[PDB]
Amino acid sequence: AVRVTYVRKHSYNTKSNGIRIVKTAGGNMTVQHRQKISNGVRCGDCGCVLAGIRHIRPHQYGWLGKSKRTVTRAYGGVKCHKCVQKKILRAFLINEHNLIKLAAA
Amino acid sequence: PKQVQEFKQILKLLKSGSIRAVRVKTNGENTKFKVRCAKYLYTYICADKAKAEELKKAIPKDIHVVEIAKKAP
Amino acid sequence: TGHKGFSYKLKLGKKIHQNRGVPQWFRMKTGNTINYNFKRRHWNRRKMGM
Amino acid sequence: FSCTIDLTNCTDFIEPKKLVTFFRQTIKVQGRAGNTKGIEVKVADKKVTITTSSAKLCKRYMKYLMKKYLKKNNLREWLRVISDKKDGFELKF
RNA sequence: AGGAUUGAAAGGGAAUAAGAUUAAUAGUUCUUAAUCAAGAGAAAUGGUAACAUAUCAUGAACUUUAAAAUGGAGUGUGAAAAUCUACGGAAGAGUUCUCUUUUCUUCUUAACAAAAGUAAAUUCCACUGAAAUGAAUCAAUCAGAGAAGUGGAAUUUAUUGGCUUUGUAAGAAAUUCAAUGAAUUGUGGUAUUUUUGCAGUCUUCAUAAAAAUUAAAGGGAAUCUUUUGCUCGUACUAAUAACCGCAACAGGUCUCCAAGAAGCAAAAUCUUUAGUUAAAUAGAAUAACGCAGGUAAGGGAAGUCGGCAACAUAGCUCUGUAAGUUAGCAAGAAAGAGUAGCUCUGGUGAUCGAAUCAGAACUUUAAAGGUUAGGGG
RNA sequence: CUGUUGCUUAUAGACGAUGGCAUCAGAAAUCGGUGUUGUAAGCCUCUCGGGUAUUGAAUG
Incomplete structure (x- = not known):
């Protein structure tokens, strides 16, 4: 087999020193540098991973399109649909209860 | 490098003044029209000789054209 | 090391420059007693300690 | 499948017959x-x-x-079989 | 507005690759192709929904959320690479009076993007409402705060979007041939290993960083081309000769990549790519006494302070395994039988393939033992 | 006369020494005798085969 060497001067297998050995022209293999695996967005209430948003590095969200870093809904990109649905029902039902309980019962 | 897909978009590339150079590579099966633009190198894979000649005529006369074959320049 | 500070590299270059012998024309001066530089060193004989 | 052997410069060394037989009693x-009844060697003059x-x-x-x-x-030691890149072989010194 | 400096060339971090090139530097030069940052030239739609639209489709103060950014073990599994292998060849080389349609070598392709074809896993959404309880995993685990089924959405899979494919791009490179010019560069595998993710399981009186910096939300204040990219390091060794031990010291000194055979094994042993045949001089002779490695008649610890040293046992399968015991062990207890070569048969799957297990003939120098490899009570 | 030297010398030997021969010398293969192993390679038979054999063995 073909053995390879690090290209940069980092000699230790740290988290930021990940490599991939891929085949090149002529049969020789070159060394790449692979990105770290990143987490996604979580709902602020239930801590569940949000859908519709990619799991990329924080600085790479700026390069994405405007619609690719959020969801077209209230609290989109910070609250899940279950998280939001309870917020709406909490807001309406509590105010309605206050209207009859107090406020000229 | 980006690839244009059908015959319409390539013509608008030569019609536009953003062009910088054109290289035509003839392969054993098809011929590629590589338009060197400012940012990217657009290429069109033409598999019909009749439509290849039409694209050759549409090239503005004031631009450099490189014809490539089994031997590179 | 490969990695070094800029001013440290210039002090390494000076130690290279000073590791030279007396030029021939200097040895032909009248009343000359300086034939060999005794402040000379080699990498494998004395470590310059910097 | 039709492959030939070119002997345009070694007919003195190899007479084409024997060679015409060689194959006949040697393809397995x-x-x-020997049982090459379906192999059409013939003479083909020089080739x-x-x-x-x-x-x-x-x-x-x-x-x-x-x-x-x-x-x-x-x-x-004197010759060396090279393919003519045209589904055939030719002999070189 | 909230608290100053320094502190990591292994922590966090905007963005570059392939080929060629030098006597020596090269993700740094050259060719080609990219990317990033900073600049210049009354406010949209679609889907029931999850959510989706080459910028689009405004969004200030203030506040909030998320990311950067988090242990380990063990199991299963997706993909790539290497190794092995099936089919079909092209080119070159090796052996060849004994055979061998034979043995060997090459058949490659980056960053960044595209979107023909097509995956595995997980989480959500719509319809319906499960008991005769079902669904499923290697294991689990799950379900009227809603299973299974049908149809969808999203994300992860070493860049865009995981894999094949495409642009780059064959014009490069590899292997050949001729004397610069010509030829080729399919398709597969329910195999092994490494790497990289994923999914749930287990474990803690252990719960396994922060900041720079980025995005989104709530709120509703106000009304394609082109330029530049500064400073410093970059040679070489990294060790049976470049480092630390007074030295070209058998000592010590942190990592990355990693072929074949054989085997449970990254063990011992042999080989391929690469490196080397020099590493404090040799020649003749073949005394004693040594250092290192061995063997030995008969006896078998009588030697000795003492079985010191050496011998001995040793892999795998089957049978069998005592007292004692904190009931978990003792245990590989102890003890016994088998094991080779060749020719066959059967069992274990999917819509051709895996090494594994069992059995039967016959032959022999009667088989773990070249290497490796418990002495027991 | 003796010593050196030669026989990569032996009845000897650490080196010296000692012993033998030195042109009718010596060395060498080959052959025969003598041993060891166990029946070669090509096609159970060739086959008591083949191989080794002084190196510190014995003839020519």
Whole structure:
């Protein structure tokens, strides 16, 4: 087999020193540098991973399109649909209860 | 490098003044029209000789054209 | 090391420059007693300690 | 499949007949050296071809038995079988 | 507005690759192709929904959320690479009076993007409402705060979007041939290993960083081309000769990549790519006494302070395994039988393939033992 | 006369020494005798085969 060497001067297998050995022209293999695996967005209430948003590095969200870093809904990109649905029902039902309980019962 | 897909978009590339150079590579099966633009190198894979000649005529006369074959320049 | 500070590299270059012998024309001066530089060193004989 | 052997400059060394036979009693059509009834060697004047359709054979098969010749007749040091890149072989010094 | 400096060339971090080139530097030069940052030239739609639209489709103060950014073990599994292998060849080389349609070598392709074809896993959404309880995993685990089924959405899979494919791009490179010019560069595998993710399981009186910096939300204040990219390091060794031990010291000194055979094994042994045949001089002779490695008749610890040293046992399968015991062990207890070569048969799957197990003939120098490899009570 | 030297010398030997021969010398293969192993390679038979054999063995 073909053995390879690090290209940069980092000699230790740290988290930021990940490599991939891929085949090149002529049969020789070159060394790449692979990105770290990143987490996604979580709902602020239930801590569940949000859908519709990619799991990329924080600085790479700026390069994405405007619609690719959020969801077209209230609290989109910070609250899940279950998280939001309870917020709406909490807001309406509590105010309605206050209207009859107090406020000229 | 980006690839244009059908015959319409390539013509608008030569019609536009953003062009910088054109290289035509003839392969054993098809011929590629590589338009060197400012940012990217657009290429069109033409598999019909009749439509290849039409694209050759549409090239503005004031631009450099490189014809490539089994031997590179 | 490969990695070094800029001013440290210039002090390494000076130690290279000073590791030279007396030029021939200097040895032909009248009343000359300086034939060999005794402040000379080699990498494998004395470590310059910097 | 039709592969030939070019002998335009070694007819003095190799007379094309023998060679015409060699193959005949040496291709192992089914492991038997000789049973080439479906192999059409013929004479082809200067060249020698096999133009075989029914039997199974390959170009590297032909180069193998060609090298059997020049080793058998002790003249492999003088010649060397090169493919003409045209489904055929030619002999060089 | 909230708290100052320094502190990591292994922590966090905007963005570059392939080929060629030098006597020596090269993700740094050259060719080609990219990317990033900073600049210049009354406010949209679609889908029931999850959510989706080459910028689009405004969004200030203030506040909030998320990311950067988090242990380990063990199991299963997706993909790539290497190794092995099936089919079909092209080119070159090796052996060849004994055979061998034979043995060997090459058949490659980056960053960044595209979107023909097509995956595995997980989480959500719509319809319906499960008991005769079903669904499923290697294991689990799950379900009227809603299973299974049908149809969808999203994300992860070493860049865009995981894999094949495409642009780059064959014009490069590899292997050949001729004397610069010509030829080729399919398709597969329910195999092994490494790497990289994923999914749930287990474990803690252990719960396994922060900041720079980025995005989104709530709120509703106000009304394609082109330029530049500064400073410093970059040679070489990294060790049976470049480092630390007074030295070209058998000592010590942190990592990355990693072929074949054989085997449970990254063990011992042999080989391929690469490196080397020099590493404090040799020649003749073949005394004693040594240092290192061995063997030995008969006896078998009588030697000795003492079985010191050496011998001995040793892999795998089957049978069998005592007292004692904190009931978990003792245990590989102890003890016994088998094991080779060749020719066959059967069992274990999917819509051709895996090494594994069992059995039967016959032959022999009667088989773990070259290497490796418990002495027991 | 003796010593050196030669026989990569032996009845000897650490080196010296000692012993033998030195042109009718010596060395060498080959052959025969003598041993060891166990029946070669090509096609159970060839086959009591093949191989080794002084190196510190014995003839020519």
